[PDB]
Write an enzyme that holds these catalytic residues in place. Structure first.
Site, PDB file in Angstrom:
ATOM      1  N   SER A   1      -5.152   3.049   4.765  1.00  0.00           N
ATOM      2  CA  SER A   1      -4.642   2.403   3.917  1.00  0.00           C
ATOM      3  C   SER A   1      -5.896   1.771   2.914  1.00  0.00           C
ATOM      4  O   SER A   1      -5.864   0.384   2.826  1.00  0.00           O
ATOM      5  CB  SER A   1      -3.826   1.583   3.977  1.00  0.00           C
TER       6      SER A   1
ATOM      7  N   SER B   1       0.301  -0.868   0.157  1.00  0.00           N
ATOM      8  CA  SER B   1       0.287  -0.278  -0.404  1.00  0.00           C
ATOM      9  C   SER B   1       0.978   1.543  -0.378  1.00  0.00           C
ATOM     10  O   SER B   1       0.225   2.672  -0.156  1.00  0.00           O
ATOM     11  CB  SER B   1      -0.779  -0.118   1.187  1.00  0.00           C
TER      12      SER B   1
ATOM     13  N   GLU C   1      -5.818  -3.576  -6.068  1.00  0.00           N
ATOM     14  CA  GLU C   1      -6.268  -3.765  -4.121  1.00  0.00           C
ATOM     15  C   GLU C   1      -7.511  -4.841  -5.000  1.00  0.00           C
ATOM     16  O   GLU C   1      -8.253  -4.671  -5.789  1.00  0.00           O
ATOM     17  CB  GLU C   1      -6.565  -3.287  -3.742  1.00  0.00           C
TER      18      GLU C   1
ATOM     19  N   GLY D   1       2.433   0.073   4.386  1.00  0.00           N
ATOM     20  CA  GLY D   1       2.878  -1.187   3.604  1.00  0.00           C
ATOM     21  C   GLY D   1       2.621  -2.789   3.939  1.00  0.00           C
ATOM     22  O   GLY D   1       3.795  -2.585   4.812  1.00  0.00           O
ATOM     23  N   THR D   2       1.707  -3.493   3.673  1.00  0.00           N
ATOM     24  CA  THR D   2       1.662  -4.391   4.141  1.00  0.00           C
ATOM     25  C   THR D   2       1.268  -5.569   3.790  1.00  0.00           C
ATOM     26  O   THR D   2      -0.403  -5.695   2.710  1.00  0.00           O
ATOM     27  CB  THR D   2       0.968  -3.958   6.245  1.00  0.00           C
TER      28      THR D   2
HETATM   29  C1  LIG Z   1      -3.978  -9.227  -0.051  1.00  0.00           C
HETATM   30  O1  LIG Z   1      -3.118  -9.083   0.845  1.00  0.00           O
HETATM   31  N1  LIG Z   1      -3.723  -7.409   1.875  1.00  0.00           N
HETATM   32  C2  LIG Z   1      -3.073  -7.103   2.559  1.00  0.00           C
HETATM   33  C3  LIG Z   1      -3.385  -5.697   2.538  1.00  0.00           C
HETATM   34  O2  LIG Z   1      -4.527  -5.367   2.131  1.00  0.00           O
HETATM   35  N2  LIG Z   1      -2.729  -5.460   3.426  1.00  0.00           N
HETATM   36  C4  LIG Z   1      -2.937  -3.594   3.293  1.00  0.00           C
HETATM   37  C5  LIG Z   1      -1.198  -2.618   3.330  1.00  0.00           C
HETATM   38  O3  LIG Z   1      -0.583  -2.719   2.770  1.00  0.00           O
HETATM   39  N3  LIG Z   1      -2.605  -2.314   4.310  1.00  0.00           N
HETATM   40  C6  LIG Z   1      -1.917  -1.313   5.422  1.00  0.00           C
HETATM   41  C7  LIG Z   1      -0.985  -1.045   5.853  1.00  0.00           C
HETATM   42  O4  LIG Z   1      -0.845   0.035   5.177  1.00  0.00           O
HETATM   43  O5  LIG Z   1       0.356  -0.928   5.761  1.00  0.00           O
HETATM   44  C8  LIG Z   1      -2.703  -1.812   6.290  1.00  0.00           C
HETATM   45  C9  LIG Z   1      -2.654  -1.120   7.718  1.00  0.00           C
HETATM   46  S1  LIG Z   1      -1.348  -2.455   8.662  1.00  0.00           S
HETATM   47  C10 LIG Z   1      -2.173  -2.715  10.510  1.00  0.00           C
HETATM   48  N4  LIG Z   1      -2.745  -3.947   9.969  1.00  0.00           N
HETATM   49  C11 LIG Z   1      -3.164  -4.373  11.597  1.00  0.00           C
HETATM   50  O6  LIG Z   1      -3.905  -5.402  11.279  1.00  0.00           O
HETATM   51  C12 LIG Z   1      -3.221  -3.152  12.050  1.00  0.00           C
HETATM   52  O7  LIG Z   1      -3.938  -3.723  13.648  1.00  0.00           O
HETATM   53  N5  LIG Z   1      -3.252  -2.577  12.779  1.00  0.00           N
HETATM   54  N6  LIG Z   1      -2.550  -1.842  11.270  1.00  0.00           N
HETATM   55  C13 LIG Z   1      -1.943  -0.582  11.284  1.00  0.00           C
HETATM   56  C14 LIG Z   1      -4.579  -2.118   6.849  1.00  0.00           C
HETATM   57  S2  LIG Z   1      -4.512  -3.856   5.058  1.00  0.00           S
HETATM   58  C15 LIG Z   1      -3.937  -2.522   3.896  1.00  0.00           C
HETATM   59  C16 LIG Z   1      -2.015  -7.886   3.445  1.00  0.00           C
HETATM   60  C17 LIG Z   1      -2.832  -7.703   4.736  1.00  0.00           C
HETATM   61  S3  LIG Z   1      -1.418  -8.215   5.731  1.00  0.00           S
HETATM   62  C18 LIG Z   1      -1.249  -9.451   4.310  1.00  0.00           C
HETATM   63  N7  LIG Z   1      -0.565 -10.806   4.606  1.00  0.00           N
HETATM   64  N8  LIG Z   1      -2.313  -9.149   3.308  1.00  0.00           N
HETATM   65  C1  LIG Z   2     -10.185  -2.270  13.555  1.00  0.00           C
HETATM   66  O1  LIG Z   2     -10.495  -1.157  12.336  1.00  0.00           O
HETATM   67  N1  LIG Z   2      -9.784  -0.557  12.107  1.00  0.00           N
HETATM   68  C2  LIG Z   2      -8.392  -1.146  10.922  1.00  0.00           C
HETATM   69  C3  LIG Z   2      -9.472  -1.642  10.222  1.00  0.00           C
HETATM   70  O2  LIG Z   2      -9.595  -1.578   9.233  1.00  0.00           O
HETATM   71  N2  LIG Z   2      -8.550  -2.623  11.022  1.00  0.00           N
HETATM   72  C4  LIG Z   2      -8.420  -4.540  10.300  1.00  0.00           C
HETATM   73  C5  LIG Z   2      -8.087  -5.474  11.232  1.00  0.00           C
HETATM   74  O3  LIG Z   2      -8.980  -5.578  11.914  1.00  0.00           O
HETATM   75  N3  LIG Z   2      -7.645  -5.877   9.930  1.00  0.00           N
HETATM   76  C6  LIG Z   2      -6.638  -6.956   9.916  1.00  0.00           C
HETATM   77  C7  LIG Z   2      -6.709  -8.320  10.465  1.00  0.00           C
HETATM   78  O4  LIG Z   2      -8.108  -8.842   9.897  1.00  0.00           O
HETATM   79  O5  LIG Z   2      -6.390  -8.689  11.578  1.00  0.00           O
HETATM   80  C8  LIG Z   2      -5.717  -6.505   9.332  1.00  0.00           C
HETATM   81  C9  LIG Z   2      -4.656  -8.410   8.626  1.00  0.00           C
HETATM   82  S1  LIG Z   2      -4.869  -8.389   7.053  1.00  0.00           S
HETATM   83  C10 LIG Z   2      -4.975  -9.650   6.418  1.00  0.00           C
HETATM   84  N4  LIG Z   2      -3.981 -10.617   6.650  1.00  0.00           N
HETATM   85  C11 LIG Z   2      -3.450 -11.549   6.898  1.00  0.00           C
HETATM   86  O6  LIG Z   2      -3.121 -12.330   7.861  1.00  0.00           O
HETATM   87  C12 LIG Z   2      -3.702 -12.215   5.694  1.00  0.00           C
HETATM   88  O7  LIG Z   2      -3.117 -13.167   5.315  1.00  0.00           O
HETATM   89  N5  LIG Z   2      -4.311 -11.432   4.787  1.00  0.00           N
HETATM   90  N6  LIG Z   2      -4.932 -10.133   4.653  1.00  0.00           N
HETATM   91  C13 LIG Z   2      -6.084  -9.781   3.421  1.00  0.00           C
HETATM   92  C14 LIG Z   2      -5.026  -5.598   8.207  1.00  0.00           C
HETATM   93  S2  LIG Z   2      -5.786  -4.264   9.079  1.00  0.00           S
HETATM   94  C15 LIG Z   2      -7.746  -4.563   9.452  1.00  0.00           C
HETATM   95  C16 LIG Z   2      -7.840   0.439  10.489  1.00  0.00           C
HETATM   96  C17 LIG Z   2      -7.502   0.523   8.836  1.00  0.00           C
HETATM   97  S3  LIG Z   2      -6.124   1.568   8.994  1.00  0.00           S
HETATM   98  C18 LIG Z   2      -6.264   1.602  10.487  1.00  0.00           C
HETATM   99  N7  LIG Z   2      -5.273   2.766  11.253  1.00  0.00           N
HETATM  100  N8  LIG Z   2      -7.248   1.223  11.337  1.00  0.00           N
END
Ligand SMILES: CO/N=C(/C(=O)N[C@@H]1C(=O)N2C(C(=O)O)=C(CSc3nc(=O)c(=O)[nH]n3C)CS[C@H]12)c1csc(N)n1
Ligand SMILES: CO/N=C(\C(=O)N[C@@H]1C(=O)N2C(C(=O)O)=C(CSc3nc(=O)c(=O)[nH]n3C)CS[C@H]12)c1csc(N)n1
Ligand SMILES: CO/N=C(\C(=O)N[C@@H]1C(=O)N2C(C(=O)O)=C(CSc3nc(=O)c(=O)[nH]n3C)CS[C@H]12)c1csc(N)n1
Ligand SMILES: CO/N=C(\C(=O)N[C@@H]1C(=O)N2C(C(=O)O)=C(CSc3nc(=O)c(=O)[nH]n3C)CS[C@H]12)c1csc(N)n1
Lengths: 265, 265, 265, 265
Positions: free
Chosen positions: C100, C42, C140, C210-211
């Site tokens: 994000s 991201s 995305e 970015g994650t």
């Molecule tokens: C197909 O996979 N796609 C994603 C994905 O949508 N990732 C996006 C990415 O780079 N994102 C970012 C961000 O800006 O870093 C974030 C912020 S990182 C974050 N994750 C948490 O779970 C949490 O509790 N707090 N914070 C700060 C959310 S997902 C979106 C993903 C997320 S983990 C994973 N293995 N894949």
């Molecule tokens: C509580 O809500 N606030 C959010 C938010 O949406 N958080 C979400 C939450 O619980 N998230 C999680 C997850 O499911 O763990 C994630 C993980 S996404 C992910 N993880 C994996 O391990 C994987 O294999 N694939 N993917 C796609 C990132 S934030 C989103 C948020 C987004 S940016 C910000 N500052 N807050």
């Protein structure tokens, strides 16, 4: 029904609670102990900075003030580190509001001049703002230690709220000086557990705290709703019946603020 | 007094607002159209997971469900990323609560089995909890589209609050499953602008949102005071006067929550 | 000496680490796998918003964008709550950077236009900035899923740092648009555990995270010293050897940032 | 290497900088003029409290000490508020560490007894800890006024760091007294802009400051990594080339701490 909940808080925390929110176009005034006297403690440092700003040009803020180790007679987290360097007026104003620096307030009181080390001039400034009730009689740290019932170094939620309203929302100060006062209070580091803790995070809160003996804990704030509507909130409390060493209860002010937020939502 | 402000919010936002907070030992019940019917929308997804947990051993969570693109009908942020992989029952539960995934709820309803894709069995589960009023009749996305006055896919703030109270604070579920349901709701990603936005940050808030046509916006929550006292808050709203295309107003739910927080402080 | 400590972090965390800090007048460039390719994830959303701002007048931010439930293909914490209301371009920019939001980035890519839903136009914008290495090929959420060794949806710490430098510190954007991009990154809610956590609190940090899968965790930032000296910090990492399900290590980014802060102090 | 950057800071701030970080199992020692002598200034007040704790049972903390206004000769923010009441030894320890109260240190030195107002007994206590180099010869405020080259009232970064290591991390004190000393240094109010400002916020920092003439600014600290790994950091400075009135520069110590944090990362 709101006075009944304030009275419950007074019983819960073994405290006397004073709350005032000036009326607006949409909302009626909230008054609990609005005209009973409570000790300023450090809440006077916000109008004090306004008094210094009011009677001096902005260029006065850059004047360097030097002081000695003998001037460190109270909690002075910033001034205690600058005995050798001195402190500018702006730093003293910043220190008095954001860190509640006691030595900084005394130097600003002296900068106002006159009898009582500036305490008469600060009271006169409140009088010029329409505040007929409040009075400052001592410097730091004595002004926090007046026994209950003593009118010295006391204000009311009503009076201090109308003072703060004029300083931040009114035209007591020109816009340039008003912004400085607002920014200092906006970046305050002492009020996280009081009015800010009782309002939702999407409300903006700028505040100046007060804490003293006899369980004294005050917080005066200007708050903005998520829609940007401003409100003045004065919350004052003491636990004087519990003696000099009575502990202040910050949670009382946070709960009182939550009650106020419910009526303002 | 409190009803005057809820009715003021209804007037401000051109909405019908339903509020219920079950009474505690210290607090009286808060009721504002508590027994009027409002559409579940996605609020049913939280007791749906409880129905799945209660009927099944924990090992059922690892059962893999496969589906096609044809099964995706409503807002499904997680299910759309797993057509090829499938999703475990646990992932469907996680997605249905935390992301309000519509496809995940339909698969969990199917996992309940019976007529109507599980809606009769889900309604039966509510009956086991003492809720004789609520009913689910359609799946996603149809259950958000019933016209006003239609009793199908409706609950009441009274009924859903007491349902949630038993699931989170009571013993409807054994402790291990209770913790799973609670943690999912605690980490919900859809309710930041509703009940969560109306309570001070030091109040813990777990919630399940609901949003549909006719301006429907719900939020059911369990909130904990700073001292750890739990309360169940059901807030439901619709704007049927604006038609099918009426936009939900999340701010209505936040303002209503702040009013509730004032009474609970 | 600094590379030896970057390599030790790589060993501690089972990760590949990329670091780049552009040289300044006083400081030399910091490079650790600066020209190796890492997945955007991201991080592209920050130059994406810059492309939308640069290509349109400020008034374009007020254009309302409507979308459907099928457009929620990704983690969209803001967009998922606004299917019925729509979202302005300005709100989508805010959501893409600070939360994000995946759907918001896809909608902004569509606003850029051209082949691949805007991926070619966004890549073209990077080319106009001198970045010949980076490329965006998918939307995305696909762009986070490319296997290691695939050059698609990849950049380098060197290239992304020089892009960010021109956008925030240079004149790629006029000052009014530059301030919007800077303020969004400054109020980002996702980077507290990365570069921000590795720098002392008196350093200002604006960032975009970015994650992704394969242990991918990036953070690109502009940091200001207590003396107001700005530096660009790009830190990228993955744990691809641990497979698709490898967990990202945010502490790696914080610790690497602390190492950089020591050389910049 | 690291010494090149410390010498850079020495040039920037026109200062002589002393740094010592004892080696651990994982890290090698950091040394920059580690065995050169620097004036204690207020840094001796931390081992001074340890000397008082070591030679007396905890009940000694409740002994009340009375003094007059003539005994107040240095920065004494607490003692000047208790001339009439007196202060217990425990309060003197609290004031000496957290507020660097000079009068409190003199009373605790007198409580140690012997020639020179306790300076010989305090010097002897350091010997019991293995410190053969350091010496205290005067009380407040004279101990800050020794000219450069004078060995009186001096220590080294090497010696005091090993002293602090034994007091906080070692077994110089039984666990209860060590906890009191640790909590006092943890709640110090004078070091926010020194070692604390140079380490990231997620590093825990306990410290004791020192400030004197000839630009002297010291800070001795124990810091804990985010993983809970402790390190002892001694940072000392003077600017004797600028004369008696040379201003101490707190930013030098913060920058040096940032340099140390980078290598400990
Ligand atoms: C197909 O996979 N796609 C994603 C994905 O949508 N990732 C996006 C990415 O780079 N994102 C970012 C961000 O800006 O870093 C974030 C912020 S990182 C974050 N994750 C948490 O779970 C949490 O509790 N707090 N914070 C700060 C959310 S997902 C979106 C993903 C997320 S983990 C994973 N293995 N894949
Ligand atoms: C509580 O809500 N606030 C959010 C938010 O949406 N958080 C979400 C939450 O619980 N998230 C999680 C997850 O499911 O763990 C994630 C993980 S996404 C992910 N993880 C994996 O391990 C994987 O294999 N694939 N993917 C796609 C990132 S934030 C989103 C948020 C987004 S940016 C910000 N500052 N807050
Ligand atoms: C003779 O003075 N007695 C004082 C005193 O110095 N009062 C002043 C006053 O009002 N001050 C204020 C402030 O602005 O609130 C403060 C900030 S209050 C505070 N201190 C903390 O350490 C903390 O962790 N949180 N908070 C909120 C310091 S004392 C000064 C005192 C302090 S506590 C007590 N029982 N008496
Ligand atoms: C780490 O320090 N940061 C401080 C700071 O200096 N805090 C200090 C600290 O520990 N303080 C204490 C106390 O001794 O307990 C107090 C209380 S002092 C006090 N207590 C009494 O019971 C009494 O009767 N009289 N007085 C005067 C308040 S802040 C100061 C600070 C000031 S403003 C801000 N944001 N931080």
């Amino acid at each position: 029904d709101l006075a009944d909940r304030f009275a419950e808080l007074e019983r819960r925390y073994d405290a006397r609670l004073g709350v005032y929110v000036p009326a607006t176009g949409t909302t009626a005034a909230i008054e609990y102990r609005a005209d009973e006297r409570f000790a300023f403690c450090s809440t006077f440092k916000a109008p004090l900075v306004a008094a210094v700003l009011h009677q001096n040009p902005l260029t006065h803020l850059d004047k360097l003030i030097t002081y000695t180790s003998d001037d460190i007679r109270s909690i002075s987290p910033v001034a205690q580190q600058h005995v050798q360097t001195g402190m500018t007026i702006g730093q003293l104003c910043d220190a008095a509001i954001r860190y509640s620096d006691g030595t900084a307030a005394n130097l600003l009181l002296a900068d106002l001049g006159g009898p009582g080390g500036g305490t008469a001039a600060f009271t006169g400034y409140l009088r010029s703002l329409g505040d007929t009730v409040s009075r400052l009689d001592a410097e730091e740290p004595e002004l926090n230690r007046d026994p209950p019932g003593d009118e010295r170094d006391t204000t009311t939620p009503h009076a201090i709220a109308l003072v703060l309203q004029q300083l931040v929302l009114g035209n007591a100060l020109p816009p340039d000086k008003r912004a400085l006062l607002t920014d200092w209070m906006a970046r305050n580091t002492t009020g996280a557990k009081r009015i800010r803790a009782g309002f939702p995070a999407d409300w903006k809160v700028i505040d100046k705290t007060g804490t003293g003996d006899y369980g004294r804990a005050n917080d005066i704030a200007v708050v903005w709703s998520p829609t940007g509507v401003p409100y003045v909130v004065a919350v004052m409390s003491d636990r004087a019946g519990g003696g000099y060493d009575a502990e202040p209860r910050e949670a009382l002010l946070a709960e009182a603020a939550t009650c106020v937020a419910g009526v303002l939502a």
